[PDB]
Every structure is written in structure tokens, then in C-alpha cells.
Amino acid sequence: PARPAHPLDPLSTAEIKAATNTVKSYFAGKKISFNTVTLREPARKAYIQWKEQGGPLPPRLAYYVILEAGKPGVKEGLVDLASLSVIETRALETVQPILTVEDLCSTEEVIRNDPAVIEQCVLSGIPANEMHKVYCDPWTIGYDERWGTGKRLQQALVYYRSDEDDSQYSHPLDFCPIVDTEEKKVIFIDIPNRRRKVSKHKHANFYPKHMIEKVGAMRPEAPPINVTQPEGVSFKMTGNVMEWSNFKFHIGFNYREGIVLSDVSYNDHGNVRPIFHRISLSEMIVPFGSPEFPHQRKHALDIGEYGAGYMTNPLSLGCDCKGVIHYLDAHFSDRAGDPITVKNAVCIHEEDDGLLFKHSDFRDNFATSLVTRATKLVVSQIFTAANYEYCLYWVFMQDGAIRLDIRLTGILNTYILGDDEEAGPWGTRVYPNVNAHNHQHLFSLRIDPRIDGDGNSAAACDAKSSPYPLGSPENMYGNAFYSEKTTFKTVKDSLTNYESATGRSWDIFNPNKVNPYSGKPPSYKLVSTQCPPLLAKEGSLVAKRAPWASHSVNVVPYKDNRLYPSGDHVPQWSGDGVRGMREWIGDGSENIDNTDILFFHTFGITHFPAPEDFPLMPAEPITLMLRPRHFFTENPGLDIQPSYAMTTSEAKRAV
Amino acid sequence: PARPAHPLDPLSTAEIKAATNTVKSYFAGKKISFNTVTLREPARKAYIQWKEQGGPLPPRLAYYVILEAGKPGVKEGLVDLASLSVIETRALETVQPILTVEDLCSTEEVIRNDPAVIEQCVLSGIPANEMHKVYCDPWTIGYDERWGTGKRLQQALVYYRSDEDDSQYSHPLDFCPIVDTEEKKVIFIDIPNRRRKVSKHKHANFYPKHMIEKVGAMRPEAPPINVTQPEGVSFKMTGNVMEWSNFKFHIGFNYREGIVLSDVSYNDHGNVRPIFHRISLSEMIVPFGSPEFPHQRKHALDIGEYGAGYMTNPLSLGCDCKGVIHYLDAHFSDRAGDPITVKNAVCIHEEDDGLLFKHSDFRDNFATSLVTRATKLVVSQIFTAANYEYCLYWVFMQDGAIRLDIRLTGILNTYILGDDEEAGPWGTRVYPNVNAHNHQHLFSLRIDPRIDGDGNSAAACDAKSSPYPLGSPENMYGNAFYSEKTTFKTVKDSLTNYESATGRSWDIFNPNKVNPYSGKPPSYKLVSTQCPPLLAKEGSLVAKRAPWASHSVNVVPYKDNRLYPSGDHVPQWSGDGVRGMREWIGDGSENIDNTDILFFHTFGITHFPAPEDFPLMPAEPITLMLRPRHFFTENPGLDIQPSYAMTTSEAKRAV
Ligand SMILES: [Cu+2]
Ligand SMILES: [Cu+2]
Asked: Residue B419 gets which letter from DSSP?
């Protein structure tokens, strides 16, 4: 296959086909299916040597995961695309892989045709001949101690639609079928002691026709707000390489993490300085808070169990991206080994972002004034996880900061509620017979830094009052306060949480350099306040399967392929064993001071449903920022043309 | 004077003149000057009775504060505009009032002509004949135990400009002159033991001409991003009354708080429901963290000591407000009693605000999809406090939420640093010989609620794991968690801080009503995470003068005229005495459950300067939100026309 323009470019449709042909040949005579075919990124050192030391172009490699009929677990390996050959291979019989759309799409039909399920629907008030009205969201079983990884399983959250255009979530059923993904059959059904028959209320719908019927009618179409860029955009893309306002980086994408930003640098007036080698979301977990069976199985690790790439929405229609947009397509492999494409998976564009800075002199009644507007570069994707939608926006700003904005929307996860049943403290009755369980949305931001070069460290920064008392010579009026910086020496030191008591922030810096003015090392500071503590207790399935979620920050030594904190194959893992973040942390004694490190940050929200979130939920914002502190010697955006500028002398001159 | 169209409208230029003529006559033969002439808002009950019970139009009243030559303190009172007469008056001899632009503008010239100051400049390396190059930011003295309120004082932070177009902040001097505001003379100069002569480095400038000289040249003008509304805006204003996306409220404005939003309601499909009777910023404090003399005097309470109204920038030029804007002018009185106008003090406009909500069905590859874009209504002002600029944005959203966004910009407060001097832990060397001291920016949001009517309460909501252990029948898998709501019964109960350990939020609700679905009282939830603890210690000048800053939340009984938490006349108050928030809290035993309450919220940031903030600082964001929870029975924006919408049946039909 033809080599890509960039070593970090995702596998092309041709490379994917070449890789699968190679694997099929290697396993000739075997009945195999493809689960994953993706780029195996080049080693960090090899990439940097190629990029800055005239080193050789790294080998183009493809990582694959396959299933073989009648064989337990999976088989994984690497294909050297240049020589069209398998160079690495191994069987993992006790693990289960990410669930693809194809793996999930057949589950609904299997439960509809299962006698045991049909009987439960009849028992629930739905005639056996109306099974076409029964729907279900196919979920990873998460983890069920009754089967471990012995069988590839899915659990089905069952719903009912009186009409195909209904939003089924107002009508969940009370039972949960367990499906054998391979054999495509229901092997068990969890049935509650308390039986709740299907709700007889109207469905809570949200399309215009439904609303016109529910409320008087729709609001009149509002006056349009048009945004146009007659002279084009200021950003320039060369393949997947982006160049904008001094920032330069590679926009990658894969089936799991979705958008992956690499080789991020900033051109500081000719001095191209590295910032991050790689940044992305490496994992997620949405732990629900109802202790009742079988709701403990609701703690989906969406990224590792379904894939932010696989679940991504084509942004073309919908009008998700307003303005002059630039799109990127994503390419994956289907079960048969054929390339599949999701068009407009990533949208890129620039928008006005308010004021960058401003200052006026009161001396001449603000006649002396300088105002510069801000513009931001947005790289976005939106993926759907059954009922929820996650809108991800990677934002680059003209002050050199990088921000990650997430907007949660879609529909609340719902379970049935008896007329007399109290949604108790575990959930909210958002509609008659509808219980929306409490849950958290936690994400694992993975940062591979290269702050102004190689050799980095991390630290926690806490604001604190001077220890000297009020009235002492050292703090006479008791107003003294400073920033206590605690640099992490070993992995154990980094396991820290956000603390409101100190307005804690974290620094990722280069101890080998110093700011000529402040005398502090150049750094990028993580300013993140939406850092919920993990509510599930220690030893819980949730805490064990997402060891990274226990702390807001985890810093470990860099190692190639240390990407996914909950392990490479997440579905059905019990959480027992040294893998993922648990393995990287080890005994916690490894050095992370002035070396190659990986910074994993846990952030998110805790959601206690309210009627306002139903039947469709208004977007809920989540944001974190990485800003330069002591990185530059002065405001880096001062050479940007001001929107307005009047000097004191120019003001006098205007008589 | 002619009566206003609305009882809450600010005083017109005519009412102001009528009020001052009345006061001048009352004090005939006395040499008085006007400090404040503003609207004395009608009693809460009277206003509500007028608005909803056909009650009489409240009396149009004007509150005034005057100074009399040779008399200590001030005189304040009320003028009944209808009868053009003083109906209330009293002398406050031991207090000092807010500092007006006129009070402040003469200070610079007095220090330039003071022999003692001139000598200090010469001693500092500046020739006596170059005093026109010496500048100073006139500050309230804050509080100096050497004079108390016995004399009206100002302190001058001295700077030097080699050229009038320079930004003086790179060149502060080491001494601090104390000025008698009335006598217009320097009565003392604080001189440090360590002498630092003026910096000989170039000034750190930021205008284009300066940048062209500092760096190669300016960046090319970037491609324009145009925003237009060909069919107009969707909001409708009738005087100061705003109507937008079901929201209805009065946009007021005064010399102190700046923007004041009143009588806020939401039209819930014909049912006009009250939300807030009044919301605004009632006070601020920017406490600096250097314990060294005389830096303890740097803890300006900008709102109460200068006025967010008095300091507001005309938004006309500058291009601060992009798009189709609607402006409001502000009117105050000058020292002579004549109305003064600041045009375009408040700008109003609507903007796109991303997605309001979205959901697609994976079953037909997202063909079934509904997308609705969000639009926000922004009411903004920008005021200048000497070196800093505060950009305030009150934002109304289509999900019924109200947000307050603040962007800090302008220039860092700076003090001189010796070549050999360590900015120590109290500040940062952001430029040669420049020390930018640590400081916090704290604000007091004042909320007078009327959540779905009269009779309100407040509570803290903390996320917590179930108390039952992992493995118990009640929490078998240890994932259970709930929201612990603690309703405040007495004032003392409300004194609470944000807690990251529980992701604490606060509810302002109506215990007299219940949501038909959830069974919870209707409420608006305060979601605020930028809540720094007050770093100054108990008993410090800072803590004593801003008793409200000690807690993130303070809830006290409503009383007419309980507006300013640090007292009505803030300058030079020692912090000793029962006034403001200290008086309202009392012994903390008063009831605040199901009654008329006032909710004061302290939020802001802690600032540790870095070179990136100099010589001009990039905007730093601060935000808090008030969102409806259990207020509505479903997403209130569902009747808004979707940007895109395709039904499952419509998707099938498209073959
Ligand atoms: Cu949620
Ligand atoms: Cu600041």
C-alpha cells in the first residue's frame, strides 16, 4: 500500500484492506472476523528522531484484533504494511474486545425472537405479536461474576415504542436479557422480584409534530444569525497537519479515542517550541449510582468498550458545525475486513471568542484604548453512546492556551418505576413510571508532554496563607499568601485530587529550562475544577475496572503503547490484575521527575437527573484548560492586529 | 420631574437635576458637593403589590450623599421627587464615601507639585524638572490605622513614563504618597527602608508601533469573521424591560453595582413564573498577598469604593460588542449636582451558543436525528479600575438557565523590584525590576429570589457515597451514591463553602410547591466552582472589611436596602462594627427557611502572576450558573424550531 504523507496519519482504506488481506492469508483456512484494524503509532523516540534528527521514516504498522469462530477470547497482532506480513501475533483467550456496531446491531433482533423474552413481554403487558414494538439498547454486560470473560456477552436494556417515531425512553421494561454475542442467543434474563408492567402513559416525545400536539405549537422560526468568512479562514491544513496562529499539530483519529492531537508546537517568533507530543481522551466510565440488581452492571467505559471513533456521528447534516467548516473522514474495518468510512467525522473551523485583551487609560476618559478580539480554532467530533451524545471540542486559543470543552446531551438513561415506587435516593422520577438513575460521567485525559523540549516533570500547586500569624512581623496584617508547589518525584506522589480548599492546579514543566524574567521553569498549567471524586467505593467493580478514576491526576513513566488506563481489552474484565493504570503505577516508586512522563487526568460531572433533562436533555458543559505559565516572556498575542487602538498622543491630536 | 415608564428605571437626567436643586435649596448657604445621587428603589412589597395586586405606583425617590467643606464625613438623605423635597436626612461624621472620578482625577497633579514627592523622585533618579513624566494611580487608602476615617484619604501608586504613550506599569517607583482628598495635599509619604531607583530598562509596551519595534512586525490582518442578522433580533425591549425567549426582566443600572437585573420571570406556556426579584454584583475585594508595608493597603473593594457604574466604559468604540447591538446609557451626578452621561454603558445582543441539544438513533445509522442550536441573550458592561478591566456578561439561555461570565483583562498591578531583589513567594518578576504581587479577585453576587413565587429557602447539596459498605445487602457492589440536601434553617446554617469533595452546589427553592413528576420543590441551582477560600486570615483588615468573603454562601433575611455587604460607605472603614453582612448575620439565629431571603455568593479567582500576563493580560474567565432543577416538568426548549430534524419514518421514506 502507498505510504502516507505523515507517519501519524491514520490507516488509509487501502492500508486497512492490505492489512486484512495479510491477516486472512496468515490464518488461511480459519474462520476469522475482524474486530479492530488500526494504526500502531511509531515509537516516540523513532518519531522524534525522524522529525528532528533526520532519522528514518518509521515502519508503517497496523494493529489488528480478530475473533475466530469456536475459539475463546481474541487474537491480536501487528502487520508490517511494507512487506505485507504479520510480524507479531498472540492469542488472548481470557479477554473480550471492544464491541463494534456490527457486534451490537444484531442483539435487538435476537431478543425479539427469543421465546423466554417474548414471554416476559407478554407478562409485562405486551402481546407476543407486537414484539416489533419492543426495542433494546445493546450494552456491554460490563462485568458479571456469573460468566467472567468465559463467554462474550451483552446485556439488553429493554424499551417499548407505541410508534416507531416515539422516543422509547419513557417506556422501559423491568427485565434485562443477557445475550451470548457469538452464539447470538439469550442465555439468561434477570427478572426483578418487583414486577412493573409497561407504562400506559403517552410516550414523552420531542419532535416538532409531537410538540405541536403536546403544547400549542412550535415557536416561530427565529431571526437568523449568519456567520460568514468572505476572505476564507486563517488556518492552513496540509493533510492532517494544522497550522494556525503559531500552533502546529497533527490531527489524528482512531476507532477508540476518536480525535488524537499530536506533535503540538508553538512558533515563538521563529523559535518553534514543542508543547505536547500527544493529547487525547484515553478512557471513560459512566458509573450509575443505584445499588439494586442488576444496575451495578451500568458503568460503561464508552471509549474502551464501544470506541469514540466507532460511535462518531457524521457531522455533515444536523448543522452541528456552523460556519466555514473543514472536514476529515474516518476509516475503520468491518467484520469482513473491508474498509468502512464515516464521512465528516471531524469538523474544523475558527470562531470569534470575545475579547483577547483590553485596556483603557482613565486619564483621558478612556480615549487612550487598545482592544484586540480573540479567535479560537475548534477541532470537534460528536459521538453517540446509545442514549447519550458526547460533543467534544478541542480548542486552541491565541494566548497559547489549549482547552477541551465537552457538552453532554442526548437522552437520560431510564429504568421503569412502579406507580407506587419511590425513585428513592438513587434516581429521579422525571416522568410517570420513569426512573432516571444517578450517575457520574468521568473521563481520562491522556497527556504526553514535551514542554519546551524533552525532560519534563509535574507538580501540584496549592494556594495557601502564609504560615505566620496575624500580628507577627512577617505577616502583620495577615494578608500574606503564596503558591505551594509540590513537584512529584515518584509515581505515588502524583496520585492527587483537585482540592477546592487550595484552588489546586497542576503544572507540567521542563526543569531543564528557566524563564529569563520570572526564574521559573516553562510550563503549561492544568486548570480544571470539574473533578468529581469517584463515588463508587474502593473494591467496587467501578473502582477496580477504572483504577485511573480514583484520582484527579495520575503521572507515570512514559512507555510506548501505554494508551488505555483500563487495559487494552476492557469488556468483561473483572478489574483484578496488574494491567493498565494499575500496572503503570506499580509499587509507585518509579521516578517521574525530569524524564519522559504520561499525565492522566480524571475529570467530569456527577449527574442527579431532574425533569428538565427529559425527554431530551439540554447540553451540559464540562471544560478544562492547559495554559502557558512562565512558558513565554510576555503575552504572546500582542502582535495580533487590534480591533481598535488609540494612543495617548493620537487621542490628544484628535483635539 | 416627569415620572419614569417603570418604577425600577434609573433616575433620568431631569430627576437627578431636580434632586440636586432640592438638596442645594435645603442646604442653602452651605458649601456642599455631590458624591452620589441615585435611585432609592421602591420597597419590595410595594413594588410587587404595584406589579401584581393593582397597588399604587411607588413614590419616586432619590438617595443622595453630599460632602460639606470643613465638615467631617458626609450627609445623606432622600428626596421625594414628586414634591421636590427632602424627606429624610442625616449626618455621618465618621465615614468616608465612594471615590468618584472627580475625587480621583486631581490626585496626580497634587503629587506632581508636592515638594516632598518631588524630592523622592529626584532621590529615585528622576530630575525635578521631569515631574510631568511621573504618573500615579489614585487609590482609596483602603484603611490606615494612622488616620481611620478622620481625614478623607487616597494613596498614590507612583509610576513613570519615559514617553506619554508608554504603559507606565513596567516602571513603578518605590514610595507611596498619602493624599488628603479635601485639602488636596500630600500629608505623608511611605518610604521603604530598601530604596529602589527607577528602572532604566525600556518600557514594556503593547501598541502596534511598539510591537513592530519589539518583534519584527505585526501579524497580517486576519480574514474577517462576519456576523449579521438580516431579519433583526428576536429580543424585544420596551424601555428597560427585556423580553426574550420567554424571559422577561428589567435592566437597571446604578453608579455602584453597575448592571442590576430585576423582576425576572419566565413565561412557562402562559404561566408567567417569577424567578428572581433582583440579581447583581453587590461588592468586590481584590486582596493582595504581600505582607510587606504598605502593601497591606491593597485590597480594593472596587464596587463599594469606586463604583462599577462610575468606572464603566462607553462600549461604542473599541469593538467590544460585535454584532447587532442595543445600547443603554447611564446617568450620574457630578460634584456640582449636574447630570453626567456615559453613553453605551450597557450593550445587549444575542449570539449563537452552540447546540442546545441533540440526539440520533444508531438503529438507522443516525438518520433519525434531531438537532437544535442554542442562542443566548447577553447583557454586558466593562469597567476599568485603574490598571484592571472587568468585563461582565449576564447571560440568559434557552434552557432557562442564567449565567454570569466575567473576563478579567487589563494590566497587572506592579511594584518596583531591585535588580538583586527576589520577588519572594509574594509575587512574580514578570519583567526586569517589576514585581507583580499575588492577589485574589473576589465578588459578592447578590440574589434576591422569588423562585416560582414567594416563600423561599436555600440548601447545600452534596454528592455522597451510600453509607452502607461494599458487600452489604444495601450496597452489594459499592456503587450506590446520592445527593445529601441540607436545607438552611437559620442564618448560621447557610455559612458554607464550596467543597470539591462533594461537588457541592446550592439550591434556592420554593418549599410551598412541588414538581408533579419528581416530587421535589421547584428550584434554581447555583453551580459555581471558582470559589476560592479567603486567603487573608481571620482578624485581618481584609477579612474584617469584607465579612462576606469568608464564605462562598451567606443567606440572610430580606430587609429593604440590604444591598452592600461591606456597608454603605466602605472607604476607610476599619472593619470593626456591626454593619453590612456582619449586621445581617447577627447572632446567626434568624430564620431563613420559607420566607423572604437574600443569597450572597462569594466567587472569584486567586492570581499568581506569570510573564504571560505582562505587559497586557490575556482575558481570564470566571463563571457561575443558576439553572432550573425541578422548576419545569420537561426540557423547556423543546418547542424551539430544530436546525435539523428527521423522524424514523421520514428516514425510511427517504428510501
Ligand atoms: Cu448524565
Ligand atoms: Cu489578577
From this structure: T
Do residues B526 and B624 make contact, with C-beta atoms less than 8 angstroms apart? yes
CB contact under 8 A, B535 and A463: yes
Fold that domain B106-214 belongs to in CATH: Nuclear Transport Factor 2; Chain: A, (3.10.450)
Which of A222, A290, A359 is opposite residue B480, by nearest beta carbon? A290
Identical fold at B106-214 and B215-653? Answer: no
- What's this structure's resolution in Å? 1.9
Q: Provide φ and ψ at A392, rounded to 5°.
A: -110, 130
What was the elucidation method?
Answer: X-ray
Asked if A318's CB is within 8 angstroms of B611's CB, the reply is no
Q: Which of B386, B532, B610 sits opposite A362 (nearest CB)?
A: B386
Cβ contact, residue pair A628, B641, below 8 Å: no
Phi-psi region of A463 (alpha: psi -120 to 50; beta: other; left: phi over 0): beta
Distance set, CA A235 to CA A351, A376, A396 (Å):
11, 10, 11
Rounded to whole angstroms, how far apart are CA atoms A322 and B159?
Answer: 47
Q: Which residues of chain B make contact with A411, given a CB cutoff of 8 A?
A: 359
Confirm or deny that B309 is annotated as ligand binding: yes
Residue A615: is the preceding peptide bond cis (ω within 30°)? yes
- Taking residue B240's Cβ as centre, other Cβ atoms within 10 Å add up to 19
**CATH number of the domain at A215-653, please?**
2.70.98.20
Separation between Cα atoms, residue B458 and residue B524, nearest integer Å: 10
Domain ranges of chain A: 1-100, 106-214, 215-653
- Neighboring chain A residues of B369 at a CB cutoff of 8 Å: 317-318
Q: Rounded to the nearest 5°, which phi and psi values hold at A234?
A: -95, -10
Which CATH number is associated with domain B1-100?
Answer: 3.10.450.40
Provide the phi-psi class of B396: left if phi over 0, else alpha when psi is between -120 and 50, else beta. beta
Of A384, A558, A533, give the one whose Cα is nearest residue B371: A384
Q: Cβ(A531)–Cβ(A445) under 8 Å? A: no
d(C-alpha B431, C-alpha B610), whole Å: 10
Residue A264's alpha-carbon distances to A22, A449, A524, in angstroms, are 34, 9, 13
